[PDB]
Amino acid sequence: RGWFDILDDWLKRDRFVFVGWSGILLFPCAYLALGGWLTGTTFVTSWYTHGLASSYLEGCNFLTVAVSTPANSMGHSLLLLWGPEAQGDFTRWCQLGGLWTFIALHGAFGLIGFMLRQFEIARLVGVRPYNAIAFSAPIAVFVSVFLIYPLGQSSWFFAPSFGVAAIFRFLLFFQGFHNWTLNPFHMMGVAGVLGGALLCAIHGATVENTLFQDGEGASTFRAFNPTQAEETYSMVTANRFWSQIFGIAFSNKRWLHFFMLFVPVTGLWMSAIGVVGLALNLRSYDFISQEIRAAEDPEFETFYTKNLLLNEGIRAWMAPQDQPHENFVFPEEVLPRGNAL
């Protein structure tokens, strides 16, 4: 019972907001990431890094504000406030995009903090740490998309900017330049997210519609006691229903809930692997057989070649404004266009 243990005592008190040892990492970093995003989106421009307005102060709305990435010329600079670029100047630092690295880095350590929180509380309460384990998927996604992906590319500039419309742009960029929808890792991601959503929906609805009548009320929520021992719905009836409707059905509850962990978590991990590939332009962009055929045979058309024409449009029409450091000037006559449009 020395100072370390007294401190431990205090950190682990059962208060409205649990603190813990992990709270020392988590709360300042989460607070700085949130506050940094709100500060940036409220007051801070993107004129000198992107040639964009990005704040409420400049006239943007909720959908168009962002804390934007730094200029491409910053490369992968940590862009510390006291670093060789800003040199201690807070204003210049804002103008150079310091808030982007501020938010991403404090954010990353905040996510570490939060997962540590999940472990810490699970250990204190006596449960298995499967919540934290599940949280590894958010981590994989954040680290692959916001850190590894730009690190593979020329600079932080091509990371996603923190904003609604900015993220939408990130998506369209990935379609145009990476053909990301063609990527089997993205596809596994989609299957995990949509499958997760499906499981959420179907499990909730099934439990709600195989409830035992445990009260007299027509509003049936009150007919449950948290301390009760009995299942509140019929697993046997659920099983027969889905067996006769869909052919197969869960019969093991433990398996059901593990599966609910497994599907979305795995999906997100796969999507992460794909983005790690896109960090190097290691894309699933093309099918070589497709291209050999199409190149030789001008009547051969599939939705794959159709989509590449779309991608070509995206790149040519978006690059000059989306990549201002390149100083692209694409004369009218070279822009790809179909008839009339």
Partner 1 sequence: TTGERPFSDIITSVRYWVIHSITIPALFIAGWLFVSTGLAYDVFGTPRPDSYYAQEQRSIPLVTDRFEAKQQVETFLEQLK
Partner 2 sequence: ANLWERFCNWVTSTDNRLYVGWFGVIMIPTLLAATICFVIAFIAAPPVDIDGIREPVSGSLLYGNNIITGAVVPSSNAIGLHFYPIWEAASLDEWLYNGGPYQLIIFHFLLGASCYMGRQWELSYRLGMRPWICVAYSAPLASAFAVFLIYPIGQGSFSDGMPLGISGTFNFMIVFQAEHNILMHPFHQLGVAGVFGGALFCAMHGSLVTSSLIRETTETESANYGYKFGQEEETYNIVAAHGYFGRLIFQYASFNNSRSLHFFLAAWPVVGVWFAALGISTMAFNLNGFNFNHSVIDAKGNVINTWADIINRANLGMEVMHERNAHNFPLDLA
Partner 3 sequence: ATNRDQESSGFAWWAGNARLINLSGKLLGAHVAHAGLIVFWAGAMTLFELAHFIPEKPMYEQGLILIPHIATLGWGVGPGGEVVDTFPFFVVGVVHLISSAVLGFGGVYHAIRGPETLEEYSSFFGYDWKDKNKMTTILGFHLIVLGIGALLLVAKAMFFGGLYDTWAPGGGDVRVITNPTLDPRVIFGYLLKSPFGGEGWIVSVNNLEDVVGGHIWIGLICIAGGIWHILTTPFGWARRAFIWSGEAYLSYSLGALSMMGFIATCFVWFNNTVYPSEFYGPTGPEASQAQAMTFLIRDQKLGANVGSAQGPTGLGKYLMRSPTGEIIFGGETMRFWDFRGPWLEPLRGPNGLDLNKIKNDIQPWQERRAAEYMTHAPLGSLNSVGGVATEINSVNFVSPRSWLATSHFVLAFFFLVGHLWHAGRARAAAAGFEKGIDRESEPVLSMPSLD
50 marked as part of a ligand binding site: no
Which of 270, 288, 116, 302 has its CA nearest to residue 184? Answer: 270
Residue 58, judged by CB atoms within 10 A of its CB (0-12, 13-18, 19+), counts as: middle
Residues binding partner 3: what is the number (CB under 8 A)? 21
Report how far residue 320's alpha carbon sits from residue 334's, in angstroms, rounded to the nearest whole number.
13
Q: Shortest distance, CB of residue 279 to partner 1, whole angstroms?
A: 21
Identify the residue whose tokens are 């962990």: 261
In the range 292-311, which residues lie near Cl ion by CB under 5 A? 306
CA distance 177 to 169: 12
Give CA–CA dist 168/190, Å, rounded. Answer: 17
| Contacting range for ligand BCR; rule: CB under 6 A; set: 27-35, 120-128, 220-228, 293-301 | 27-35
Q: Does 115 bind ligand CLA (CB under 6 A)?
A: no
Contact region with ligand BCR (CB under 6 A), list: 30-38, 114-122, 160-168, 243-251: 30-38
Q: How far is C-alpha 326 from the chain's CA centre?
A: 28
Element (H, E) at 67: strand 66-67
User: Applying CB under 8 A, which of residues 35, 51, 320, 336 lies at the interface with partner 1?
Assistant: 51
Q: How far is the CB of 306 from Cl ion (least distance, A)?
A: 5
Residues 305-324 that bind partner 1 (CB under 8 A): 324
> To the nearest whole angstrom, how small is the minimum distance from the Cβ of residue 156 to partner 2?
16
Stretch that binds ligand HTG, among 2-10, 131-139, 227-235, 331-339 (CB under 6 A): 2-10
With a CB cutoff of 8 Å and minimum separation 6, the contacts of 189 are 267, 268, 270, 271, 274
| Least distance (Å) between residue 83 CB and ligand BCR | 14
Among 206, 210, 271, 284, binds partner 3 (CB under 8 A): 210
Q: How many residues bind partner 1 (CB under 8 A)?
A: 31
Contact 69, 159 (CB under 8 A): yes
Residues tagged in the binding site annotation for pheophytin a: 118, 131
| Contact footprint for Cl ion (CB under 5 A) | 306
| Contact footprint for ligand HTG (CB under 6 A) | 2-4
